[PDB]
Design a protein around this nucleic acid. Sequence first.
DNA 1: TTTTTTTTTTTTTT
DNA 2: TTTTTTTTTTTTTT
Lengths: 242, 243, 243, 242, 243, 243
Amino acid sequence: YQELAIQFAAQAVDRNEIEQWVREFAYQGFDARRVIELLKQYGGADWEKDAKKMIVLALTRGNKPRRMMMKMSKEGKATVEALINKYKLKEGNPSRDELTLSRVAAALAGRTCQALVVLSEWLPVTGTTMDGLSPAYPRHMMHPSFAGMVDPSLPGDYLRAILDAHSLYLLQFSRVINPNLRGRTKEEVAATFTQPMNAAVNSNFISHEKRREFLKAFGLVDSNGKPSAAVMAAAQAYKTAA
Amino acid sequence: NYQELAIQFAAQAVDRNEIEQWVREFAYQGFDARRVIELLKQYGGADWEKDAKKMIVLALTRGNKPRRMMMKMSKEGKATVEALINKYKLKEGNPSRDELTLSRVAAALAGRTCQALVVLSEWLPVTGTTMDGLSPAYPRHMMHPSFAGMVDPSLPGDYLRAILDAHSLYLLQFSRVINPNLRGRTKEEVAATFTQPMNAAVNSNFISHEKRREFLKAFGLVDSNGKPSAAVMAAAQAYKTAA
Amino acid sequence: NYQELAIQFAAQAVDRNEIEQWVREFAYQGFDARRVIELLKQYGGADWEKDAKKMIVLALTRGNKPRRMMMKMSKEGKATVEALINKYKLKEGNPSRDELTLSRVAAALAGRTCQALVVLSEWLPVTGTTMDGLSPAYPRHMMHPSFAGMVDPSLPGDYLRAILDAHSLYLLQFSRVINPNLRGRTKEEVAATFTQPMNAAVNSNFISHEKRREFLKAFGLVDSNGKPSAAVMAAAQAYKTAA
Amino acid sequence: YQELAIQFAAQAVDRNEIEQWVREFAYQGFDARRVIELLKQYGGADWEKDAKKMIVLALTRGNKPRRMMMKMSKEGKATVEALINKYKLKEGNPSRDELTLSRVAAALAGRTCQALVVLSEWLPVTGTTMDGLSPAYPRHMMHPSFAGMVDPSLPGDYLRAILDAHSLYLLQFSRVINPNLRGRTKEEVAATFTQPMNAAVNSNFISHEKRREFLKAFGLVDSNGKPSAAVMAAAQAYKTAA
Amino acid sequence: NYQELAIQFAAQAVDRNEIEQWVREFAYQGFDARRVIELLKQYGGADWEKDAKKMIVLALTRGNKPRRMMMKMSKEGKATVEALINKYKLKEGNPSRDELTLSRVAAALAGRTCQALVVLSEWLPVTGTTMDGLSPAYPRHMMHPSFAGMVDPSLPGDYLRAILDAHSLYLLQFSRVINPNLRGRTKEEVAATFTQPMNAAVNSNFISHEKRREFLKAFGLVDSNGKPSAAVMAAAQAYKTAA
Amino acid sequence: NYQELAIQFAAQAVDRNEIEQWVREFAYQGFDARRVIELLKQYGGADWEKDAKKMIVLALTRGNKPRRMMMKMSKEGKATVEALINKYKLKEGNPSRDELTLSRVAAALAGRTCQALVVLSEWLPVTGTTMDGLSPAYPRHMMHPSFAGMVDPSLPGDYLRAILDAHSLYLLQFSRVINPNLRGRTKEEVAATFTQPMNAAVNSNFISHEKRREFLKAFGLVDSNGKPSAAVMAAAQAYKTAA
DNA sequence: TTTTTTTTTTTTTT
DNA sequence: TTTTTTTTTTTTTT
């Protein structure tokens, strides 16, 4: 009777039926498309220049705009106050239709990752610090929003190399900005940062082709997707990392 | 007096089959698969199978807290989950023998659940890609706790151990990701929390030994005589040196 | 010159028999085995032996908390445990002396408990396989604290020490598994929790020296003259170098 | 002016003046003389036999007489109840004029330490367990009341040998019976047990001559106070102990 | 073919000067050195320089909590600290920007602070002797976070990196001593707390590149062309292998 | 503008003596010895010296909690302590600059305190015998925190370090015994709590360098030129390898 | 960031 | 003895 669970198992699996359901029940959190829609809406023609300012502001000062405003120059405070009021900026994790410095940096990952080369020594974990862990550490990987640039169709060994090279940074960064991860083990830090990382790697924002074009442009992969010597070095550094 | 009674009681031959029936009957039981199927049929009627398939995808990719997952979901999804909560009177955690949870549905219907893992691989808390980094071509059919429900316990001990150590490589990763209070603990400490539910499913009376080995053969996990595949052997070893 | 012979007499001359009578009279007695068997016969009647066998399997593979174990068990098992709780008025932990617990049943009937361990080996908190990893072909009859009640204290000291060190290898593992705080403590700290109950049963008045040695002989633990087996000798050494 | 603390320092120290003061301000805790006075008072002619019973009772069952009574034989419970009522026994640490099983064992250290040879395998830390740490561990040292048998006039190296040999046991025992010391470091256990140990070693109860006569009788020292091979072995085992 | 050149342009072509203006404009500014000196002159009058010297000694050897330090100090000292608190309206921690703290005084007057370190060396939380154990003849002028304000950012990159790594060896020690939770954390975790304030002062508009290099030359940290000294080179290497 | 003022302020030569006066004046101060003596003389009158001797024995062998020690003391002792509490208005712990404690009395009169240690050696929390086990013939005059008050800081650095490392061997033991919350901490962690009060007493203005070296010479701790004794040298080394 | 004499003998399958 | 998407960037001599 009840061991008819065999008949239920016997039915061949439908890739499209299951893919409709996984799509319907999917975690709906960060919408990069909505963020860009809101920036364009509040900023108008100035949205790009203000977004670049907000990327610098997020990467070097954090996600609390009213707090950072208090320990800043006269000119800076005036710019941040204008941005808070134009873009109706918030702190932390508000509703889906609300903008934060984090969300701006995350939706515009292509622009954020390019800025890291210049901003490297102004970050919580500097390029110099990373170079101590792995020589000539890839600066374009030094932000959680880099996960949105990873082509998931890349050969598994090449893909794992990029993510292990990026995880070397995440391990340092997470232990430093997440109060719950201060001094915790590698395995613990990776268990808290892999699920949001892998969601960004397998998101529908930016096609595989565009993602690999960015990795090629940043000099992270070659013509066939083979990671650079620096990525390979970093990927190994993560395997023996503490 | 009572010493003579203790000797005469011990003088009686050990009944291997009587004790083996009892150890089975009193064994740990995480859920009654038969009661779960009985409840799905009762609440769902003729739609119970299609709704069970939905709940398998829902459990595997979103978890066991239906009202919580509903908060970070689309309008359509939110409506499907709300309808399922109300039809099947779904609960979170470990409720009574007469209550349904997304976990229990996936666990009672292990044969289908394990088959879905091939498609759902990159949407799981621990992806197939991640597992391949630990052990090459990691068996996707093993990437769910309900896989223990498909293991034939009559398999030769060495073959049986290799299947379970392979599966344990996944369990070790999965437990650290889905359970935050197991993240800083050792391999031995994490294994201590997942071996009892695993071994219960392996030694349960739900789905016979013959049918269970037929599944392992079909999933390509064992050969004609029950010898595990190279991938299973590789993962069992990866688990022995795992941290 | 008299004070010298006085400190000499008060230090060297000890009334070994007077002290040995007292230590036995004051020894921890959570229960009297004779009273336990008297209570089983009283509540169970003609079925007391079959129910006692069930309670031994239940105590060895599930523990001493009958209402707790009942919740993660099959429909049939739960119904058997509930029936046993109500017939024998079973309790958890350490109640009064006219009270029965699964532990006390297994302890009073040590002769059958120890015989069941051969069949139940892979269902115990510490399996026979796990023990074999510490000492080859570990004696299964020693894999329960109630084994101490089977030990003949009149055995030659060296033979008696081999039996107890061999049994202590198991106790060391068992205590760490059934008491998680002990996992990070020393052999000496873990030993401190199990040596007093062990030595009390070894020197108890329940079952004579002659019968106790006839059990050790029957279990194949000692020879005709009380010389321990190769497996016992191996286990006794494994304990000396154990951590 | 105020640097006249030099004139205060300049006064030569008086050994007898200081010894009167240390005597007057001394810690007044356990009075072995009062304990024996109370045993004789309540027990009469039976005080010695009842004291021997109470030593066995303390060493193998503890210091809680009403508690131990509940998990004991009919005969034993009857004896313990009679002892509780004759000697007005208490649990824990009551007033100076109150008897406890601990205080009885401690005041009659000579009798207690002799009983350890027979009681060895009934103790929280057995002789067998100790033999695993140091071969043929001295059974007479396996009780805190042994500190009352130590001659403090012994040559420093011989004296330290006896106390290091005894401390090997105290380390095991303290970690086991003191809930606050469960799994703590050697240095921590020794910091909590050295002050009460050293007080018993330097107490006025039992003269130096009698103390050394006991150590000689127990076979712990030779004619000149040189410790035995077992004590020497144990003293070393404590130096490398964890 | 245009989308290719578009991803190429949006990845490689970065407006280095636009971004560098912004990072400087938004940089953490707990205080403006010019405002600190303006406030010292305003409250202190003609005595502002002598009182500032006192506050530098007070900040370097006692900390940033003036009312706290006052309690474990001599009669004369306590009276001096109380007078300074009331004249300069001193605060603890990180107050508003028109507020003075011992730290802000030492930071705005980096040129004298760093010069005082030669005399104050054995009175600091991390002594010169301690530093000499990590790197021989460690540069005493680098033994304060305010040293970063003395660093010329126009220096050749390799020379600039030697100065900062040499200074970071001190910062690593100092942070562990003045923040006890950091003692059990990694170089990278400890570095994360001191690199942002360091790099902000290195790239601040207070004191020109030309003057900053004239300080490094005067302190004997660099030569005529900006090449660091043997001690700086030694300290830069000690930091690379530091734990 | 303010940049030019910062350069001209730094252009002024470093006044070594002005800074050295200030670092002394602002240095940590556990107690004012002068105020303690002033208070003893005020409350005690002509009996202040004899009562101070009593309080030194009381602090050294019983501690700093006078009402607490009174509970485990003789009738006579109890009366002496109660009389001293009421005459000198004695307090426990670390009260105001104008309050007396047994510790402060012993600390302000270090010359006498250190001389008493020879007689009181076997009555201290850490005995002379215990210390001799760590380092042969350990200097008894060093067996009190107030010994730091006798150290000449003008001594050659290597000689000065050997005296303090020797003394630190005792401090390490003493702190673990008198302070229960320092028992599980490392050498570095315990040293972190006792170096600041030690170094304050070493660099205090109470009792000149000349008088302090005269004491070290008298106690046999240094020779004619300040070279420490073999016992001091031995203890300094014992501290380097201490746990 | 301090300040001087341990505590006190049977558990029980997460 | 459990059950699926981190948190969010300046401290300050015990």
